[PDB]
């Protein structure tokens, strides 16, 4: 019951990221959120300004078929207020010439229940970049 | 006050890992702990059996000079029970020929206050492997 | 007689895959089927959703000449209900510029006779990816 | 109950392979067993003569620490006589200089219950070679 | 108060460089300014003639989206007349095909308060070149 | 006269670094000194603890012939309290086999006259690492 | 006299292959013919179905200038019924941009005089592939 | 019966080559024998002087374990006087450090029954060189 | 006074080379002039015929922006008749796609005052070729 | 006098080759002429048929500017009937994009005075291929 | 008869070179002899001083087994005084570890009958260097 | 007569450099001498201090056989006081394992007759470094 809620909210976040829906993304993310990801080049970025660039330039333009598979999710519940979820992500997309391609990443997300709703406080990503290479 | 406690416990964990003190490491880690790290080759490993190999074969034998610098730690407190810490780690070591070398990693750790003491539930590492290459 | 049936059903499966006939493919595959293949990047995928992407985007569009040769098939019969077949597959195709190309794979397939008809339960592929590279 | 038996026999086979115990290996393997593996260079080898070389020259000499982790096993039962098991394998070993190393493979095994005991009829391996590289 | 002034003037300089506004750039730079940068190929260039080429040919033509993030600025005040600022710079841009890309540089700038206004006397840059590669 | 003083103090600092004289180095460096250098891997390090490792392990052991040439020094004087010096540095050394080798770096140093004596507040280095590679 | 006949029939076969004349090729080849060639990827292919693909897609379309030189032919006559011929083959062709290119192969052919006419039973080719690369 | 004789004589030749028994090799080979092999660098060598070097320097000194597997032999009988045999060859050996290694070759051999005994007239080899690389 | 004359004549020569003005170039060069340059591939070329090709085909056609910086010129005067000048040359240009690029060369020129005017007798160039690569 | 004649005839041959004048080339070449050149791939070709391909396809079509420089010719006269000439050849040409390029070769030519006129009997070329690469 | 003499003298020269017999080599070579060879780096060397280094340092010390095969010699006779010979040379040797190795070269030699004995005037070599690489 | 003097003094300088005779080298070099060479990494070095390192560490220790060939020297005389010489230099040496090696450089030297003796004022070197690589 409690783990299904975390899985559901993570699925909502992933679907919002896929569609370039920056409004929903801003709604589910904490203002002070922190991130490790391949695009930051080893640095820790804070806030949502760093990620708005990719929504504006990549997600809000591209609409080609993309399929996402979430493998072996694991959830840690820390009281009734906070949770952590870690999983593997396989993304199938199409390159410039229209040839199917696949990429893999490992992702961790930390959720806090602020004022009655779940919000990401930190997230760490490894493996393939979010920007899909041809 | 509360962030200093997390910094202190993280420093204790790092120092215990450096010295190959598997007893302290087992004391600070949750039995169900999960890990993402370069050595797992993209897989999520559970338990402490995976890490005991490196204590037995690397940390419990090597004693050459190693210096660790922790850069830009950031801490999220989620109530009074749980916390998350993210930082950059620079490690200076000596290779096989005795030439100084440096490596960088990005690390996240999730702490839960179980039965009055902090314990790692999940951790995610990126960048250089823990096993120092020559 | 019994080995010829397995060879025939494997040929039907291969021909259905070649033509992008997802209906027949779904008919010959078990709902709980598992797969190892180069496209999964070392992971074990379950179900038919992972493979539907390539039918939608590769097999249901491309129609260029493709020739398939099956080398040294070997069949193990396990009672009257189950069988296993292992073979080498050589595929001749045309790249982007229209130059003939060849690729090789090694393939194993496990068939179970459910409710009177054969169905794949597991399959493992090595070598060249199914997505033909230029 | 029935899946635990397959897991147990697979663990016995893996432990026997680790120790270079060619007698047990010959006991659990069918005389007509077939194999796909990286060492065969894309060919299908039959019988146990191909594998005896590595028992004689690698397993029966080397005794350095090796740790094996089996990830996400999946089992298909085909009646009461036959079964198939597919899993990921992580192997931690020591190279020539004594530096810890890790390797990953994907493995499928087909078991038949002949005359009251389980025996491998076919097996397919992908990823790292069994011969551990430095 | 005094560090905020240096941060503000550095932001003005960066924004002027971004827009290809050579007039403002010439206004903020000392005539005898010196520079280390990747484009000089290990040499120390003096004056503003070396940099006018890139304003004429790159900044005064290109207008595609560019986002700049300044990480961990550190400021040294040397009396009331001079200051030094060192920081990391992350630049997000679009390559030839329109794919988002990121680059990192480390930058130091020395400011002198001449005749009541701040002016750059020397600057040293490392990492990615200013000319954004595809 | 005033530029000769800066050149002299820079020569003293370089000679002290060459001889592994950590006492003199600590004497000439400000406690809050900051540094960009290739060994930090793109990060800004503060304090003298990061550099003590190389004095302990490289400069305090090695004593092979090393020759240093300083090319085209340029000096900016900012009042009577602060100065900046930028130059090219050629280092001739011997590798592991005893073969002469040469390396080049570009270096900037910022000096502040605190309590009547010059002290480094910041320094930025590019090109070859200080640790001489074979 | 008898060696000239083998040379003549080999020349006829080569000319028929050059022109994409699959009818003549089928006439000169035994139904059970076997082949080693670079395109088979280390496998032994039997029959003429493997080679029909290249006649259909490469020889029956391309008509650009091609020049063939046969170097140092050697012939072994085994009775009055069978012969073997081994030679070097240099092929001059034009790539995609129209630039002359050259390739070399080593070729062996085994001829049997069945029902009064010579027919290839086996052939082995090394070196450059028949499919001419740009 | 007649194909078994060719298989037997080929096995004798391979075993004689393995043991460095140049006398038997000279006995089974025709004086005018011709050869294509990787060691000749694309040239056709005649006689047995080219191969005597490897018997003198490699086969007559090395005695480490070597295992040979012959895959998918195919035989063409041309009357009662001549035959041709084509097969794949897998060789397992030990490199300089004692690590097991495997190599693959494709081989064709032409036998003529002179004065009542079989003799090689021509042979063509592809793939791995006979000289085993570490 | 005398060094300024050499600097002036060298600037005239460089400007004439930049504009593809072969007449002025021929006027400033001795008929027996010799040259070392990267385009000669390690050979010493004599006369002006070798350089006329690049005037005809490169300088007399291209007119895109090019900026030249001369660094650290050094002049040796040998009596009143002859001089030598050595300097570093940085060239900023635009590649095929219009991206700014930079190149560096080291250049020596020997001037003789024949019949009252200066003329190049020999010149030696190292580093980047004169033909600007994209 | 006698060396000038050889130089003249060599210049005529080179100019005829440059213009794609196969008639003159055939006139100056002996029917039994032999050649070593990079295009033959290490083989010795006899006759003029091998070279006619490049006249037909390269020299008889291309007419872009090409400049040839002959460096350090050396001539050996063997009686009044035969001579040998060896020289270096620098060729300046234009690639596909119109960028000047240079290539170097070393060439030897053997001339025999048959029936009162000089004819090439053998020639050996090293270095760059005659077919000019972009 | 006349071609056999040239073959004999060439064999004598090759055998003398193999044994490091600089006296015989000097006896068979003309004082003004010229050479193209890979060791000269594209230059034409004159005299015997260049080759004496390799006799002193390589041929006069090494005595390991070396086997030479001469393939497809071709001879042009120019009157009764001069001749030219061109051939392929295969050399089998042993590297540093004692592993057999093979190399190929193409060679031309020009002989003049001075004062009643044959002498080399020019020679041109391509392919592998004479100095055998491991 | 006058060119022979320059050749003689250049030979003396080269022989002095070969023997590590720093006294003679200092005697023939001007105090203000300038140099371009590969070891300076694109910089112009002044004085003899830069070159003393290689005399101390390379020439004054190594004594293995080295042979030098000077190809195609060209000399320009500028009055009776100054001269310039340009040539190619081939150096034959022995690497670490004792294998002969060859290197090529292009060199220019400017001589001035000061107080009755010739002295180098400038020299420019291209190609192989003076420090001989294995």
Short mmCIF file of N, CA, C and O in Angstrom, two decimals, chain J residues 2 5-6 9 30 75-84 109-121, chain K residues 2 76-83 110-112:
data_model
loop_
_atom_site.label_atom_id
_atom_site.label_comp_id
_atom_site.label_asym_id
_atom_site.label_seq_id
_atom_site.Cartn_x
_atom_site.Cartn_y
_atom_site.Cartn_z
N UNK J 2 74.78 12.47 -72.03
CA UNK J 2 74.09 11.19 -71.96
C UNK J 2 73.12 11.14 -70.78
O UNK J 2 72.08 10.47 -70.86
N UNK J 5 69.93 13.16 -71.69
CA UNK J 5 68.98 12.41 -72.50
C UNK J 5 68.06 11.56 -71.63
O UNK J 5 66.85 11.49 -71.86
N UNK J 6 68.62 10.89 -70.62
CA UNK J 6 67.81 10.08 -69.72
C UNK J 6 66.85 10.97 -68.94
O UNK J 6 65.67 10.61 -68.75
N UNK J 9 63.99 11.96 -71.32
CA UNK J 9 63.02 10.90 -71.60
C UNK J 9 62.19 10.60 -70.36
O UNK J 9 60.99 10.31 -70.47
N UNK J 30 58.21 -0.92 -72.65
CA UNK J 30 58.46 -2.21 -73.28
C UNK J 30 57.27 -3.14 -73.06
O UNK J 30 56.63 -3.09 -72.00
N UNK J 75 71.74 9.09 -61.72
CA UNK J 75 71.73 8.32 -62.96
C UNK J 75 72.97 7.45 -63.02
O UNK J 75 74.09 7.92 -62.79
N UNK J 76 72.77 6.17 -63.32
CA UNK J 76 73.85 5.23 -63.58
C UNK J 76 73.78 4.80 -65.04
O UNK J 76 72.75 4.31 -65.50
N UNK J 77 74.88 4.99 -65.77
CA UNK J 77 74.98 4.57 -67.16
C UNK J 77 75.75 3.26 -67.22
O UNK J 77 76.86 3.16 -66.70
N UNK J 78 75.15 2.24 -67.86
CA UNK J 78 75.75 0.92 -67.96
C UNK J 78 76.05 0.65 -69.43
O UNK J 78 75.24 0.07 -70.16
N UNK J 79 77.23 1.08 -69.87
CA UNK J 79 77.55 1.04 -71.29
C UNK J 79 76.79 2.11 -72.05
O UNK J 79 76.34 3.11 -71.48
N UNK J 80 76.65 1.90 -73.35
CA UNK J 80 75.90 2.82 -74.21
C UNK J 80 74.47 2.37 -74.45
O UNK J 80 73.75 3.05 -75.19
N UNK J 81 74.04 1.25 -73.86
CA UNK J 81 72.74 0.67 -74.17
C UNK J 81 71.72 0.84 -73.05
O UNK J 81 70.52 0.90 -73.33
N UNK J 82 72.16 0.90 -71.79
CA UNK J 82 71.23 0.84 -70.67
C UNK J 82 71.57 1.90 -69.63
O UNK J 82 72.71 2.33 -69.50
N UNK J 83 70.54 2.29 -68.87
CA UNK J 83 70.71 3.28 -67.83
C UNK J 83 69.67 3.05 -66.74
O UNK J 83 68.67 2.35 -66.94
N UNK J 84 69.94 3.63 -65.57
CA UNK J 84 69.02 3.58 -64.44
C UNK J 84 68.95 4.97 -63.82
O UNK J 84 69.96 5.67 -63.72
N UNK J 109 63.77 3.76 -62.26
CA UNK J 109 63.39 3.37 -63.61
C UNK J 109 64.61 2.88 -64.37
O UNK J 109 65.68 3.49 -64.30
N UNK J 110 64.44 1.78 -65.10
CA UNK J 110 65.51 1.14 -65.86
C UNK J 110 65.17 1.26 -67.34
O UNK J 110 64.12 0.79 -67.79
N UNK J 111 66.08 1.89 -68.09
CA UNK J 111 65.90 2.18 -69.51
C UNK J 111 66.86 1.34 -70.33
O UNK J 111 68.04 1.22 -69.99
N UNK J 112 66.35 0.77 -71.42
CA UNK J 112 67.16 0.03 -72.38
C UNK J 112 66.97 0.65 -73.75
O UNK J 112 65.84 1.00 -74.13
N UNK J 113 68.06 0.80 -74.50
CA UNK J 113 68.01 1.39 -75.84
C UNK J 113 67.80 0.30 -76.89
O UNK J 113 68.74 -0.27 -77.44
N UNK J 114 66.53 0.04 -77.16
CA UNK J 114 66.17 -0.98 -78.14
C UNK J 114 65.93 -0.34 -79.50
O UNK J 114 65.21 0.67 -79.60
N UNK J 115 66.53 -0.91 -80.54
CA UNK J 115 66.37 -0.46 -81.91
C UNK J 115 66.45 1.06 -82.04
O UNK J 115 65.76 1.66 -82.87
N UNK J 116 67.29 1.69 -81.22
CA UNK J 116 67.57 3.10 -81.35
C UNK J 116 66.72 4.03 -80.51
O UNK J 116 66.85 5.25 -80.64
N UNK J 117 65.85 3.50 -79.64
CA UNK J 117 65.02 4.34 -78.79
C UNK J 117 64.98 3.75 -77.38
O UNK J 117 65.07 2.53 -77.20
N UNK J 118 64.83 4.63 -76.40
CA UNK J 118 64.83 4.21 -75.00
C UNK J 118 63.46 3.67 -74.61
O UNK J 118 62.43 4.21 -75.02
N UNK J 119 63.46 2.60 -73.82
CA UNK J 119 62.23 1.97 -73.37
C UNK J 119 62.40 1.48 -71.94
O UNK J 119 63.45 0.94 -71.58
N UNK J 120 61.36 1.66 -71.12
CA UNK J 120 61.38 1.18 -69.75
C UNK J 120 61.23 -0.33 -69.74
O UNK J 120 60.36 -0.89 -70.43
N UNK J 121 62.07 -1.01 -68.96
CA UNK J 121 61.97 -2.46 -68.83
C UNK J 121 61.42 -2.82 -67.45
O UNK J 121 60.65 -3.77 -67.31
N UNK K 2 72.74 -17.24 -68.83
CA UNK K 2 73.04 -15.87 -68.40
C UNK K 2 72.15 -15.44 -67.24
O UNK K 2 72.58 -14.66 -66.39
N UNK K 76 65.84 -9.10 -66.33
CA UNK K 76 65.98 -8.40 -67.60
C UNK K 76 67.46 -8.26 -67.92
O UNK K 76 68.22 -7.69 -67.13
N UNK K 77 67.86 -8.77 -69.08
CA UNK K 77 69.24 -8.65 -69.55
C UNK K 77 69.32 -7.52 -70.55
O UNK K 77 68.54 -7.48 -71.52
N UNK K 78 70.25 -6.58 -70.34
CA UNK K 78 70.40 -5.41 -71.20
C UNK K 78 71.79 -5.48 -71.84
O UNK K 78 72.76 -4.93 -71.32
N UNK K 79 71.87 -6.17 -72.97
CA UNK K 79 73.15 -6.45 -73.57
C UNK K 79 73.89 -7.53 -72.81
O UNK K 79 73.30 -8.35 -72.10
N UNK K 80 75.22 -7.53 -72.95
CA UNK K 80 76.07 -8.47 -72.23
C UNK K 80 76.70 -7.88 -70.99
O UNK K 80 77.43 -8.59 -70.28
N UNK K 81 76.44 -6.60 -70.69
CA UNK K 81 77.13 -5.91 -69.61
C UNK K 81 76.27 -5.70 -68.37
O UNK K 81 76.81 -5.64 -67.26
N UNK K 82 74.95 -5.59 -68.52
CA UNK K 82 74.11 -5.16 -67.42
C UNK K 82 72.86 -6.03 -67.32
O UNK K 82 72.38 -6.60 -68.31
N UNK K 83 72.32 -6.10 -66.11
CA UNK K 83 71.12 -6.88 -65.85
C UNK K 83 70.36 -6.27 -64.68
O UNK K 83 70.90 -5.49 -63.90
N UNK K 110 70.25 -3.92 -59.56
CA UNK K 110 70.82 -3.61 -60.87
C UNK K 110 72.30 -3.96 -60.84
O UNK K 110 73.06 -3.42 -60.03
N UNK K 111 72.70 -4.85 -61.74
CA UNK K 111 74.06 -5.38 -61.81
C UNK K 111 74.74 -4.88 -63.07
O UNK K 111 74.15 -4.89 -64.15
N UNK K 112 76.00 -4.45 -62.92
CA UNK K 112 76.84 -4.05 -64.03
C UNK K 112 78.10 -4.90 -64.01
O UNK K 112 78.68 -5.12 -62.95
#
